[PDB]
Amino acid sequence: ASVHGTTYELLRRQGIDTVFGNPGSNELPFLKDFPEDFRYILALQEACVVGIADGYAQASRKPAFINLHSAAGTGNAMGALSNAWNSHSPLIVTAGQQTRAMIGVEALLTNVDAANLPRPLVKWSYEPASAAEVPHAMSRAIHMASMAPQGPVYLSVPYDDWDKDADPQSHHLFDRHVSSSVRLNDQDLDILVKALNSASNPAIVLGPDVDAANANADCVMLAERLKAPVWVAPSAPRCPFPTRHPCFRGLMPAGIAAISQLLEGHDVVLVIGAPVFRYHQYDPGQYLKPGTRLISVTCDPLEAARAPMGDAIVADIGAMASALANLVEESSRQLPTAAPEPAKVDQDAGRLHPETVFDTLNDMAPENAIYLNESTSTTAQMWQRLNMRNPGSYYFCAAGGLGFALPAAIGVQLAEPERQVIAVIGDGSANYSISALWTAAQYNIPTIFVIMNNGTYGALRWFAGVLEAENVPGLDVPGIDFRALAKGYGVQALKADNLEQLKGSLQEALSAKGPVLIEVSTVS
Amino acid sequence: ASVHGTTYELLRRQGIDTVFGNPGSNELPFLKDFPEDFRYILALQEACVVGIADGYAQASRKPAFINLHSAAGTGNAMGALSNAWNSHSPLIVTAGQQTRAMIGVEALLTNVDAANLPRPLVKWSYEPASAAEVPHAMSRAIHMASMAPQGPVYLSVPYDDWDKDADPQSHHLFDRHVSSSVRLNDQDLDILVKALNSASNPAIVLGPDVDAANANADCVMLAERLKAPVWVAPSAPRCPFPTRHPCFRGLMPAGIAAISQLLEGHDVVLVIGAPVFRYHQYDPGQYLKPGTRLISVTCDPLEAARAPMGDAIVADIGAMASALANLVEESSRQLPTAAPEPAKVDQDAGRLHPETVFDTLNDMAPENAIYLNESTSTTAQMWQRLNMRNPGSYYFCAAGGLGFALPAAIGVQLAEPERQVIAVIGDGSANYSISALWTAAQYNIPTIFVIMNNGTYGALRWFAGVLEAENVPGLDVPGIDFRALAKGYGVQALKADNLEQLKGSLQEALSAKGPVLIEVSTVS
Amino acid sequence: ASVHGTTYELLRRQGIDTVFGNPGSNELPFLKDFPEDFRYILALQEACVVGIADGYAQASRKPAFINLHSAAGTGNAMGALSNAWNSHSPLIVTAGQQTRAMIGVEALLTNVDAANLPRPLVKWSYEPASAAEVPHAMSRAIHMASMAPQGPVYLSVPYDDWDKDADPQSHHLFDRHVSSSVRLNDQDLDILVKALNSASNPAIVLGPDVDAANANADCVMLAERLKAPVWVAPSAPRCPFPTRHPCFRGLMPAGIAAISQLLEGHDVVLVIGAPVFRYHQYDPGQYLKPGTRLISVTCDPLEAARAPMGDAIVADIGAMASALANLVEESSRQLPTAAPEPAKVDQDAGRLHPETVFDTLNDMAPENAIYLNESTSTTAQMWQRLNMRNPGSYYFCAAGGLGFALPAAIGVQLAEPERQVIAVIGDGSANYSISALWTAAQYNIPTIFVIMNNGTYGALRWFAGVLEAENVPGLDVPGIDFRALAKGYGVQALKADNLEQLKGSLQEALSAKGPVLIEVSTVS
Numbered sequence A, B, C: 001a002s003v004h005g006t007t008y009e010l011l012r013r014q015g016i017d018t019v020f021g022n023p024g025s026n027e028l029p030f031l032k033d034f035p036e037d038f039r040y041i042l043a044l045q046e047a048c049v050v051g052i053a054d055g056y057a058q059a060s061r062k063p064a065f066i067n068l069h070s071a072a073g074t075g076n077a078m079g080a081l082s083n084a085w086n087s088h089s090p091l092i093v094t095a096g097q098q099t100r101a102m103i104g105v106e107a108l109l110t111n112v113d114a115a116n117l118p119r120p121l122v123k124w125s126y127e128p129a130s131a132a133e134v135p136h137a138m139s140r141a142i143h144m145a146s147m148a149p150q151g152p153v154y155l156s157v158p159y160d161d162w163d164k165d166a167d168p169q170s171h172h173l174f175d176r177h178v179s180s181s182v183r184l185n186d187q188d189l190d191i192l193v194k195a196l197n198s199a200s201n202p203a204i205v206l207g208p209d210v211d212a213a214n215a216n217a218d219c220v221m222l223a224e225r226l227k228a229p230v231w232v233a234p235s236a237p238r239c240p241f242p243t244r245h246p247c248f249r250g251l252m253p254a255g256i257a258a259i260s261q262l263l264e265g266h267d268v269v270l271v272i273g274a275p276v277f278r279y280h281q282y283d284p285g286q287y288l289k290p291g292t293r294l295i296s297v298t299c300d301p302l303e304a305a306r307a308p309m310g311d312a313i314v315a316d317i318g319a320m321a322s323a324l325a326n327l328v329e330e331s332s333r334q335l336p337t338a339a340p341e342p343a344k345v346d347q348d349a350g351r352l353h354p355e356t357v358f359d360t361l362n363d364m365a366p367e368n369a370i371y372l373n374e375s376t377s378t379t380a381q382m383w384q385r386l387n388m389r390n391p392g393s394y395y396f397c398a399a400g401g402l403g404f405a406l407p408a409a410i411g412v413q414l415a416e417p418e419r420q421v422i423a424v425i426g427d428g429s430a431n432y433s434i435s436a437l438w439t440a441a442q443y444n445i446p447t448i449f450v451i452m453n454n455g456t457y458g459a460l461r462w463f464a465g466v467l468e469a470e471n472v473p474g475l476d477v478p479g480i481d482f483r484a485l486a487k488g489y490g491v492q493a494l495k496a497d498n499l500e501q502l503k504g505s506l507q508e509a510l511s512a513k514g515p516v517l518i519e520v521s522t523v524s
Ligand SMILES: Cc1ncc(C[n+]2csc(CCOP(=O)(O)OP(=O)(O)O)c2C)c(N)n1
Pocket: A079, A374, A375, A376, A377, A378, A400, A401, A402, A403, A425, A426, A427, A428, A429, A430, A432, A454, A456, A457, A458, A459, A460, B022, B023, B024, B025, B069, B072, B073, B076
């Protein structure tokens, strides 16, 4: 069989039925005779292609397959790959290369030294040495993306390879299964369990790999047994815990001093599925104050190695959370009391406070809504004001790279047609991947986009305060008409200039059959 | 003095007065106290930032300075860097890094293994080992970008470096001059001149480094003296010769067979400032037929090494073109006859043929117009139908990466306020860097954008023919309203649905004070 | 024709007739049917292979061809490649790779991600995508190594490629010539010449690229015309000037302060063919004192960019030295006074002072001897005490990596059979590449090896003084019998335990027909 036929058979046998792409000449021999059991999702720029695929992979908890055009297409996607690396997203990024005989003369569209292009943002990067072994290289890519710690991989394929005969041993690839579903050996697990049972004032911190593993419910059980407060680790890309559960204590600020203050007094701190820690802002102080032992469970050796404190165990989050939840004793300590309800902020008949927007969303959205956040100055309020009961309910750019949420919201909605996706995106952030809107229109993917328009890069004004930076250019973005941008790409466009309009526009959007963009005038 | 103060002094002393950027926290300590003799040009996404800077650099024939945000911002610009590499654009790309103390824990916005990120698309990539040596690193970056063969470079700077004391010997950097303005030694130059003088039927092929060097007029003199036909090398990123000069024979098709047939019969072919050759489509045949000797003058050792045929000389294009033009004898052969005028294609009262669009542009645009091309199915007709008499009159994505022309047209217009820039961009290509429109509106940069809307990726339909590729998904882009997109970013939007409307809209756009977008309905 | 046949034809047509190698399975399809007009030089370890080839290339002023075994062979040679990079040695390093079909499974002897292995120590590194284009890749490698600035390159070739059919257009590669023989344009050259003519107290500093270009005689004329003192730039890999010419001022110490003190009072300093500057030890101070302008002529853009001071011109050293020597005016100033003769140090009838050894060598060696230095604590004395009148008379590890001189002395002797090579090597340094001795015995290459045995890493004891480092382990190397090592590899072994024995052993060695090693007992 041809490399083309064999490769699509491998993909379908490994569970893949969707190609996210932006096409070019080097990809036509791969895309031709596109099989009837596959679907192609076109996006108009490669940051959008990868963002959509990323959302889809994160929500589906399965690998997503991408096809880009040579160096220029790969290059346009590299900011998106930076986020995918930090979120451990299983992305198989393929890019078409020139014919083997043209690479050395560097014909137009040659991807020069291709394997090096996406580094250091991929787990594995490769250009096969022969056409016949392309299916083997694709198998390697699929498994490298899917094994813990999951992440993006890159495969560059010369376009003349697809019509060649595949290695006739390729069929052994089709049904290979690779497991990383491992947990600490019994002897050492029993020791850890005794340490948790012996703690007088334990605390738990959860990161995004909990939600990726769907270990949320096991973490709820563990927190209830230990009667322990639970925080989400800073710079959170996902939500690993029901945010109105009595044990929940919210998002940790991404500051060294802020976090060691929160942990003080807790004799054992158990961190599960997070780096230790994804700090951000300048906030100097102690990593960990005296009297606290930290134990980290992570799926990623790189995280375990770089932690500045604590013991670590490298294992599967799902398997470890399930084991701990079922082995620890039920403590007779008092169960924590829930955090108080957020205060209502007064809202006059003018521009909307972000607190008003989140309170209104929480009042009106379905209880299984999925939120994406790229409204960078309002994250703390978002976490306080949205009740997110279910797994898979929150996404935020895991490497801080803007241009994630708008396309990712489309991919999430494609993966989860039964759950309403609502992306809350600042006016600045919306531009990075604005053309992704077209894909929602074209494929009638009913994502709701809430644009928080205050005319400025607001979070950068906050950082300017922290960093004592005055006379800084480039912080204001006046003169963008988001309803016109939405019309440009075929998406229904509503406005909300006051609270009454916000309520009406959301009511309408939640009743719509296609995607809807709401431009909200928010306070500066 | 501080690293901040010393670095701005180095930049101004080296002739830099403009920063193209999209800001973030790691860049605030660089951008604060922004000096009064500098200007900042904001763009909304980093492919746009780099495209604008690239157009500015290419048109101004001087380095452009860029400031991006860590890995995510750098990553978003990597497709743009692929084009810049191929066009030898002197781009100084700086990116802010986390504090030195935070890199090791990989805080959010740490650019991990930063120097490797932009490779292989840069000449030089570096992260300084100490704050005090940041000015030295910047000096190295400036000169690496500016020396032949010019190209992009990358410097990653931890944000805590800017407030530190600079090396007190940094002042030696300020006025360093580095020259690569070199040409072949007299003995070997005389040998080359004799070979040209005795050729019976010479031909000349010119590439983009001729236009970069402003060697165009010297090449006209050389062609007139040798009485030689002149072609532009394939996949042309720039125009190196007056396109209605009698010697001019047009753009070479980017095909191996096509080019060897054109050169057949010419005993000596002199290639100046081009790779040998930037082939593209599948078009197998001989590189060079018997009876022809090829001599290449290139500024780039990499080009010289990879040519499949001919002798090469690595030298400055300006210096070599000037020397040759002034040393060769005047041949008594007949001057080549000018190419025939293109035929006027039949045009009814409906959608526009591209030939009609180019004929109308050529009739109406000023003689010193500057064109950019990202209308990928219409390039051959564009070259035939636009009379471009002056240097610096044409730009096309040098690596074939879409998303170049829209932002680059803004940078070119900023560099050349006295020359009307007209970007001819397909409906597909327009989306890659659509947000760049905002920069033209905000800074009132009066670029004209002509969107050729035929609803499809037309060039990919053509490639599908050559590659015999049927049932290919993703080739159509219906449902984009470009007038609404322009309104979204504050750019005046006109329509042209037929020839009368095209004439009217162009007359208006040529009389406008700000940027204008014209959406032209073209034939499928 | 086969890839094998075509590749050997390319090598011979490009002037290569010698393969330096250590063989393995992946190289047998290349080495089989070895052409009768080629010679193979075997060495027993790959650092030795590369060092021998390096000496041969440097002395012959032409590229040398190397064949190593996969990753392990390449890896064993990487210290040698570090020296080759710094000396701009034109080395074509080929390494055999596994068959294409086995690279992806990573069979034993697969060179994984091969092109990245030798980086950053090579100008170009590549693994061809198709067998048919291996001759093209070899052409690229030859020209990349040979173009200014010359340096090592790497090509990894799957072993199944050699028997495949070569691209039948490969014959266009055979006679390609690339010239980098360029110099500054007339206008700017005349400006430089006027600045040199107007200088009141010029100084000249010369580096290794002068000797590589055989520009030595032109630099002598330039110095005589300008009546200027001449230094050799620090950490000198080669000798660019007659060391007893009256202008010669010796080797610059490799310290920042030391060099600015030496240059004080000189209004113009012209540096030719050197980095500015290859400092070594800690010696902080001013790079250049006020009142001194520095102008650097270098063949290497990387050197020009990183200099912390001065103007620079990137051009061919041969072409520029010849041009300047012939254009400058004869100065009316007095010629510099020759340096005084070195003093004779007291020498008893016991162990030899190094000064005694060098004085004796200078008294006895032929005037056209070629010296190599890897006696690290005695370099200053060697430069003061050896009269080297001719080009090509001195080599020292250009990156400071020990293991160079012993093998390189064999390659230099192979390249220059009419000049006696004398390598002066410390007892510590001798061990790094000791097995190279076998190649001298086997091929009867009559190098003389003078081992300076003082039982210690003496230069490191000096650095420990500068760095105030006490209680350092590993500085002594007692108990090595060099006469036994020489016998081990079949090289005649003599001793010199006092001055009379040194005189006798040198007289004998200079009359020998094969290689000779002399173990000299030197003071500690
Ligand atoms: C690709 C990329 N470029 C720039 C930044 C820096 N970024 C940090 S937040 C921010 C402002 C975002 O503004 P907006 O989306 O309007 O939200 P606000 O801060 O106003 O709530 C910027 C530009 C980034 N993180 N990623």
